[PDB]
Amino acid sequence: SRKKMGLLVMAFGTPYKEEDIERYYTHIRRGRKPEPEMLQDLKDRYEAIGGISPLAQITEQQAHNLEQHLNEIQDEITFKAYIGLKHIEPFIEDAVAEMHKDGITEAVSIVLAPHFSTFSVQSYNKRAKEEAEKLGGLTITSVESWYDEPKFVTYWVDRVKETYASMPEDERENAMLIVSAHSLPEKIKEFGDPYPDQLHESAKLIAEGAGVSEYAVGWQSEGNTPDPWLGPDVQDLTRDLFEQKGYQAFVYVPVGFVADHLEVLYDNDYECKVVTDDIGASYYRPEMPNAKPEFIDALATVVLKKLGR
């Protein structure tokens, strides 16, 4: 009685082992293979954050955990996950092709990044749909943003209430909450990209639901190019908020991210820690959602509401 549907889970991507990093960034660097020293730098970071192997695994887990969950909270449709990544195989265009080969004719996709942006999400979705049209007999309904999904906010609000709840009285009262997402070229502004607004909105929600009056919005992991990117970067903002109001603690909630990426384990737990430590403040960073039930559930609702279920 169930209708067979495709569940296209998309994401930036992650190398599966040390030996894939070169090609991985090249693709990110748009055909520009990293210099030997930058290459050995990248390996070290990955080596530093506990290794690469666990990284990709988190995505497979989120995909198959969302698939099974969706399949038991409703009985009308039966989903079959298909991962499509941007900078590494399986690429989006293959994920869409395999689905086809499998007789899937009706699919609903979602990108593992709560916020919308023309640079990433729109790109992923348009690519997923174009590959389809090319093949034919295959339609995809794409989610664009879910950062506002109540269950996704509740997730972050509690991790925050937990973190401030564990703070020494001393700290609780002189702490700053920094909500952030992956920085993107400023130029995205001439298209009216809502990316920056939405992130500010994720801050407002989480801070509000958590009862935190003081907070700020930042950006991070910006790439290198002539044209300006979104600021202020988390490092400067931290140090800036400190020299202006000497906070004793900073709680980093990289809401733009959904898992234990390099962007979070090194750019937040290291780079930002380096600033908190330098200025004498305590570093705090709640668990990422990863593949936890509370997250997958939220993700489910996002997918079902998209389908009117």
User: Which residue from 295, 230, 234 is spatially nearest to 260, judged by alpha carbons?
Assistant: 295
Closest CA to 81 of 68, 100, 91, 94: 68
Chain CA centroid to CA 47, Å:
21
What are the structure tokens assigned to 45, written together?
């970071």
3-state secondary structure of 30: coil
Which residue, 59 or 221, has its beta carbon nearer to Zn ion?
221
Looking at the Cβ atoms of 163 and 221, the one nearer to Zn ion is 221
- Nearer to Zn ion by Cβ, of 62 and 221: the residue is 221
CB of 261: closest distance to Zn ion in angstroms? Answer: 9
Using CB under 5 A as the binding rule, whether residue 268 contacts Zn ion is answered as no
Nearer to Zn ion, 65 or 221 (CB): 221
Which residue's CB is nearer to Zn ion, number 138 or number 258? 258
The residue number whose beta carbon is nearest to Zn ion equals 221
* In the complex, least distance from residue 272 CB atom to Zn ion, rounded to whole angstroms: 15
Task: State the minimum distance, in angstroms, from the CB of residue 183 to Zn ion.
Answer: 8
The rounded distance, in Å, linking the Cα atoms of 143 and 124 is 11
Cβ count within 10 A of residue 168: 10
Min separation Cβ 2 and Zn ion, Å? 39
Pinpoint the alpha helices (H) of 150-250. Answer: 150-165, 169-172, 195-210, 234-245
Helix, strand and coil content of the chain, in percent to the nearest 5, comes to 50, 15, 35
Residues 194-223, mask of contacts with Zn ion (x by CB under 5 A): ---------------------------x--
Q: How far is the CB of 126 from Zn ion (least distance, A)?
A: 20
117 sits near Zn ion (criterion: CB under 5 A):
no
In whole angstroms, the minimum distance from the beta carbon of 279 to Zn ion comes to: 25
CB distance 255 to 206 below 8 Å:
yes
Is the CB of 42 or the CB of 143 nearer to Zn ion? 42
Query: Would you count residue 180 as binding Zn ion (CB under 5 A)?
Result: no
Contacts with Zn ion, residue ranges (CB under 5 A) = 221
